[PDB]
């Protein structure tokens, strides 16, 4: 007979046919999936009086346990079984309620922001409900649905109730970001953005995807803070951090200005770095898990040797700051010293007037001042062999994988910013953001500047041709530029940064899959021209959107500070050696646009930045960022079982893919990053990769590390993020 | 270990067929000329063609001048120093003959009572008792020691083979059986407390724990409310967590569902309760503690064993002749062998208990194209274990008609007219619909009239050596792989699963099982017909679980599943590695 406990709580006969129907429903259009198999594996686990919810968990998991490269459509079987389950949880039945009825109920429960009701009339909610296609829910992979349920869908964190489904999420985010649009154009904007995101053309960060529509206004998920050489600025920096990490924002910290140990910070740098670390960890589960930061300083800082080894675990406690990552800042002069086999002279920034500013803004001024201070021996200084200092840095980079590199000359010669007025002097946590900052007096200092960036990404696997990017760039830029006005700013310097420059960072996901589907690879050069073709279209249309918006709504307050204002374009400033590795001509009229920019300006001072992605890409089943997958099947753990995701279209493309470890080396990949950077406003989170078993006695040689470092330099690469080392 | 040989000079004096013919001659020696030789022939045939398997002591000694054949004994220990010594002396005498020991010691009062020093020093004593005839106080001589989950000292007892304690906290070289009942589980499910008592402080409470569930209910709650009584309180989840934790790491903390052994049983729990098991958890018989090594009022349960080879029979009706043969041969052995301790002789001549099971079950399922993990073998197992039990009872019945029912027969639920088919855990109905095929009613009557020669007939033991002899999969267990590798000083020994050639995909190898549910269901269906119990394992591959860690939730779920399907005992937990 087999009894079952219902959705509320009392028994009833077991209906094996109902279960079989839901399975048959979920299996429609899928290939190589056995309903019968799933039935066998789940029925065996049942028992007299099983709670009805647990019957679903069991079939979902049973479908999920069968995901393989051979049978990838189990991704969608399990997903649909989960969507179905999530529906009955949220609504009581499969069919979602009417949009208005749902919104009203949610605002009344304190889960959706009440302004939605203000800003839209019931008729306007009836119209939006007709844009919605709930069957788009059937298009998610299993791992996507786990993410939605984990960190997207409005839910009761304590009771574990889910209150909403993915399309309501999507429609309402659209409603909020365009809420303040004129009736004339508002709803058509809402529709076209809903479509773009529900069909995965556009990806959006977790804070925006989980909160926009709810009573909250905290969406900033990465901040950049520069710290002056004073105890007031140290405290301002520290207090800013605490406020930001309490909202789970990543932190990039420039601290190279802090004077060296034994100066007229008699005690120097490291006690203050410790302080920032505990600042960063001040809202972390147990002073360890969550809250992240990258701290930046120059390669020529007097304390550099101690700073390089800060996360090496073979020191005493006062010599180590293990739980932050670091960005070493390098320029052309520094490399030359390595190449020419010469010395590098270390100065405390406090002792060398004008030297720190030039290091970013003016290369031949830096040249002059540096050599002056090298000859002038009243100045406190240390001398190191260039090879040895680079050796140490790369040594620490290789073992921890998280000592980064920032080419500061490249960030300022090839940049949307005039390095005299607004130099780029640091990055963020992941090394893709590059914006002006100004140190702070005081937490509330209105003359400071904290760079924030708002993010999104185009899904290169979901667009059919490059010209779809025009509509999509209109949508992404507008949606994000509205968000800048929507969100709150807990620190005035941050508000200054965001309203002055209105900076955005829109990048790509699914690039690997894109290359595969165009039969190109990473390691051989075969994807150079296609990348040039591809990243030209991106940047051109992004600038076109921001331009159309400056014409509609006025250029950003500080626009005059961009090289753009001066009539310069990325296509004018890119590292010239890029010419030697791609001959793709430009396809879009950069000149008509150069002019239209000189005339009407840009709504946003930056538009593009290539960030890593993990969660965004999982949602639309995409390869992460610009990264080659490590293998065909991604394995993840969650208390709900092993989570498996199969690379998109494995079936037709398995040999088209060039999996990460199949790359003979880094040169090909580093060349693509270079070609990409030609058009990218900000920077790119670019990794370096090494398999020991490609090298004599499984040891990666220093020679190779330095060669790849210089290669990245040569192709105008702004930043170098992770070094991944394979094992076994 | 079979062929009569010169242990020192290494000469062999005999070949396998002489072994087989002569074992037949001895067990039937005392038969009338009229029927004797035809019995000898049919038994020779049954064993030489592997239809019937027999234990090592019987196979190596029956025909030789020796009379020591008992290879498993069950001893219950009263709460007194005389009984402790009686138990200890019995053990020493039995292990000197290489017998496995099952020891019930739950009656021993807790530490700090009016055994002021309590349980653990006495467990140490039994351990050295068990090891008293072992090569170097380590290799050979084995025991499982039983006690209730509610014993006041339970928390210390659970961790006895964990190696992360001081020496006085550990008794590492015995295995343990934790005894649980419906009330104990309910406390886990309802998320409530379990109250721990010393058995000395709670009159009638220990007896009811086995014999009477609602009496246990009453007394337990009484003593919970009555706070003049010495007691400790633990969260049910935590106590179960601890037990399963120790079970998982050592693999040898067993479980015994004492309510199941007494509600579904050949024994009237008022007169003769089942209160422990043996070494491997398949034996379940009445015992009575001893005054004294020679106490004629004690009872030591012995069981005589054999097995049917399911791969060597062509249809289920061959089991009639085979059950006649197995029961008769074994019941004769009871009269043949010596008994070094009077309480043991009492147990064996009073109840005449036997334990006949199966080998080659995995191969049987394969050759019928069924599997373990999916439910596909439920009805076939029901079909199969009905035939076994029906014909075993038929043999014992024909024998009670020929030679008189066993002296203590009146103590079986059988005498009362009850049959296993009347008492089995009722949830078994929800997982198999195979009807009965044999006339249980004609037999119910013929049992009420003429009784049974043996109070128990069936028990499913593990096998290693028996199955190797006839090239069979061990017991009811799925093989770990297609080829078994063994070492001996004569080189690597390899055995290939029977008919690998035609059946390689028919087999469901152990680690190919998504989980335990399917297997646990078969054990349940089997237990419906089994007099005693079944050596049933639980199995876990870490790499089927997030971050290779088997969750507690799953362990408790499988535990409750086994409970739900009327599983009497749970033996080994095997954990895969790599």
């Amino acid at each position: 007979n087999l009894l079952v406990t219902k959705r509320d709580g009392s028994t009833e006969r077991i209906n094996l046919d109902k279960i079989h129907r839901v399975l048959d429903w979920a299996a429609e259009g899928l290939h190589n999936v056995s309903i019968s198999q799933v039935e066998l594996r789940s029925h065996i686990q049942f028992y007299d009086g099983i709670k009805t919810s647990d019957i679903h968990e069991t079939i979902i998991k049973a479908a999920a346990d069968l995901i393989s490269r051979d049978a990838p459509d189990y991704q969608y079987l399990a997903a649909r079984l989960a969507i179905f389950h999530l529906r009955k949880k949220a609504y009581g039945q499969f069919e979602p309620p009417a949009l208005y009825d749902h919104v009203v109920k949610m605002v009344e429960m304190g889960k959706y922001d009440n302004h939605l009701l203000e800003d839209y009339t019931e008729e306007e909610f009836k119209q939006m409900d007709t844009f919605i296609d709930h069957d788009r829910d059937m298009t998610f992979s299993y791992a996507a649905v786990k993410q939605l349920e984990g960190k997207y869908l409005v839910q009761n964190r304590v009771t574990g109730e889910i209150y909403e489904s993915a399309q309501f999420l999507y429609i309402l985010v659209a409603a909020c970001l365009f809420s303040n649009y004129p009736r004339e154009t508002r709803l058509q904007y809402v529709k076209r953005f809903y479509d773009a995101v529900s069909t995965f053309k556009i990806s959006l960060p977790t804070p925006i995807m989980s909160g926009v529509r709810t009573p909250t206004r905290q969406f900033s998920s990465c901040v950049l803070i520069e710290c002056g050489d004073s105890l007031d600025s140290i405290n301002a920096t520290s207090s800013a951090i605490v406020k930001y990490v309490s909202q789970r924002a990543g932190i990039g910290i420039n601290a190279g200005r802090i004077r060296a140990l034994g100066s007229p910070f008699h005690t120097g740098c490291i006690p203050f770095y410790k302080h920032f670390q505990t600042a960063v960890k001040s809202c972390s589960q147990g002073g360890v898990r969550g809250g992240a930061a990258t701290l930046f300083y120059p390669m020529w800082h007097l304390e550099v040797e101690s700073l390089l080894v800060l996360k090496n675990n073979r020191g005493v406690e006062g010599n180590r700051v293990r739980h932050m990552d670091y960005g070493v800042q390098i320029n052309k002069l520094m490399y030359t010293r390595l190449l020419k086999g010469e010395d590098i002279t270390l100065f405390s920034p406090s002792d060398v007037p004008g030297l720190y500013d030039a290091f970013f803004a003016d290369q031949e001024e830096f040249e002059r001042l540096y050599t002056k201070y090298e000859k002038d021996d009243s100045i406190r200084k240390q001398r190191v062999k260039a090879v040895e200092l680079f050796s140490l840095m790369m040594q620490e980079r290789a073992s921890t994988g998280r000592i980064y590199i920032q080419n500061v000359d490249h960030c300022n010669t090839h940049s949307p910013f005039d390095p005299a007025i607004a130099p780029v002097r640091q990055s963020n946590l992941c090394l893709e953001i590059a914006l002006p900052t100004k140190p702070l007096n005081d937490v509330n200092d209105e003359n400071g500047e904290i760079a924030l960036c708002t993010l999104s990404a185009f899904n290169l696997g979901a667009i059919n041709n490059l010209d779809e990017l025009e509509e999509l760039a209109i949508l992404a830029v507008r949606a994000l530029d509205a968000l800048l006005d929507y969100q709150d700013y807990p620190i005035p310097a941050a508000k200054r940064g965001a309203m002055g420059r209105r900076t955005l960072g829109i990048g790509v996901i699914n690039f690997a899959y894109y290359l595969a589907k165009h039969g190109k690879r990473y390691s051989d050069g075969s994807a150079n021209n296609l990348t040039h073709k591809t990243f030209e279209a991106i940047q051109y249309y992004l600038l076109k959107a921001s331009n159309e918006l400056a014409k509609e709504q006025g250029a950003c307050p500080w626009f005059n500070e961009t090289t753009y204002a001066k009539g310069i374009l990325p296509i004018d400033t890119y590292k010239k050696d890029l010419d030697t590795i791609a001959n793709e001509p430009l396809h879009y009229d950069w000149e008509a646009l150069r002019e239209s920019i000189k005339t009407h300006g840009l709504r946003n001072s930056t538009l593009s930045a290539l960030m890593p992605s993990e969660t965004s890409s999982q949602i639309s089943n995409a390869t992460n960022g610009i990264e080659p997958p490590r293998g065909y099947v991604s394995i993840k753990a969650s208390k709900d079982g092993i989570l498996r995701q199969v690379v998109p279209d494995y079936e037709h493309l398995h040999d088209a893919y060039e999996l990460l470890w199949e790359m003979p080396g880094n040169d090909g990949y580093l060349q693509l990053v270079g070609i990409m950077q030609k058009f990218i406003d900000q920077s790119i989170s670019a990794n370096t990769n090494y398999d020991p078993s490609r090298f004599p006695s499984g040891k990666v040689p220093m020679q190779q590390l330095l060669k790849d470092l210089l290669t990245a330099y040569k192709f105008g690469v702004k930043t170098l993020y992770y070094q991944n080392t394979r094992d076994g | 270990k079979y062929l009569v040989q010169n242990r020192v000079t290494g000469e062999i004096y005999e070949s396998a067929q002489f072994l087989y013919i002569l074992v037949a001659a001895c067990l039937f020696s005392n038969y009338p000329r009229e029927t004797r030789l035809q019995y000898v022939k049919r038994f020779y045939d049954a064993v030489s063609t592997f239809k019937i398997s027999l234990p090592t002591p019987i196979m190596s000694g029956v025909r030789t001048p020796t009379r020591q054949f008992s290879s498993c004994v069950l001893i219950e220990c009263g709460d007194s120093l005389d009984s402790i010594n009686a138990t200890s002396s019995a053990i020493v005498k039995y292990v000197s003959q290489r017998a496995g020991i099952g020891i019930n010691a739950g009656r021993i009062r807790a530490l700090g009572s009016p055994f002021h020093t309590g349980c653990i020093p006495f467990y140490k004593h039994f351990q050295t008792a068990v090891k008293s005839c072992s090569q170097g106080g380590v290799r050979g001589g084995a025991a499982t020691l039983f006690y209730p989950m509610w014993h006041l000292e339970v928390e210390s007892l659970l961790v006895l083979k964990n190696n992360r304690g001081v020496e006085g906290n550990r008794v590492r070289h015995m295995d343990y059986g934790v005894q649980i009942n419906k009330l104990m589980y309910t406390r886990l499910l309802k998320g409530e407390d379990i109250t721990l008592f010393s058995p000395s402080d709670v009159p009638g409470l220990y007896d009811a724990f086995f014999a009477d569930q609602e009496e246990f209910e009453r007394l337990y709650t009484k003593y919970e409310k009555d706070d003049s009584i010495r007691k400790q309180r633990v969260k049910a989840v935590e106590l179960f967590s601890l037990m399963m934790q120790e079970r998982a790491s050592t693999g040898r903390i067993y479980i015994q569902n004492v309510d199941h052994c007494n509600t579904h049983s050949p024994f009237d729990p008022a007169i003769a309760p089942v209160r422990q098991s043996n070494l491997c958890l398949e034996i379940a018989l009445p015992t009575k503690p001893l005054n004294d090594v020679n106490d004629e009022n004690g009872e030591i349960a012995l069981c005589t064993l054999s097995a049917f080879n399911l791969g060597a029979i062509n249809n289920l009706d061959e089991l009639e002749e085979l059950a006649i043969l197995a029961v008769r041969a074994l019941d004769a052995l009871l009269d043949y062998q010596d008994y070094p301790i009077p309480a043991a002789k009492r147990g064996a001549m009073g109840r005449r208990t036997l334990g006949i099971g199966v080998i080659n079950f995995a191969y049987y399922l394969a050759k019928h194209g069924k599997r373990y993990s999916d439910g596909s073998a439920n009805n076939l197992t029901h079909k199969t274990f009905e035939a076994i039990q029906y014909y075993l009872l038929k043999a014992s019945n024909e024998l009670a008609k020929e030679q008189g029912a066993c002296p203590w027969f009146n103590e079986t639920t059988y005498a009362k007219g009850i049959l296993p088919i009347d008492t089995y855990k009722k949830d078994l109905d929800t997982i198999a619909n195979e009807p009965l095929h044999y006339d249980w009613e004609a037999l119910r009557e013929s049992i009420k009239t003429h009784g049974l020669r043996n109070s128990t007939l069936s028990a499913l033991m593990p096998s290693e050596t028996s199955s190797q002899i006839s090239n069979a999969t061990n017991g009811i267990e799925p093989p770990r792989g297609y080829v078994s590798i063994k070492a001996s000083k004569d080189g690597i020994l390899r055995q290939v699963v029977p008919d690998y050639e035609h059946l390689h995909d028919a087999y469901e190898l152990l680690w190919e099982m998504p989980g335990n549910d399917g297997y646990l269901q078969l054990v349940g269906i089997m237990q419906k017909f089994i007099d005693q119990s079944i050596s049933a394992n639980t199995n876990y591959d870490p790499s089927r679980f997030p971050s290779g860690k088997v969750p507690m939730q799953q362990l408790l779920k499988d535990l409750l599943t086994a409970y739900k399907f009327g599983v009497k005992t749970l033996y080994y937990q095997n954990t895969r590695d790599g």
Partner: peptide, 16 residues
């Protein structure tokens, strides 16, 4: 090694 993660609510459903 095991994962000590017990859910009393998840268990409590089961009928013995």
């Amino acid at each position: 090694q095991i994962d000590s993660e017990v859910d009393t609510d998840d268990l409590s459903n089961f009928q013995l």
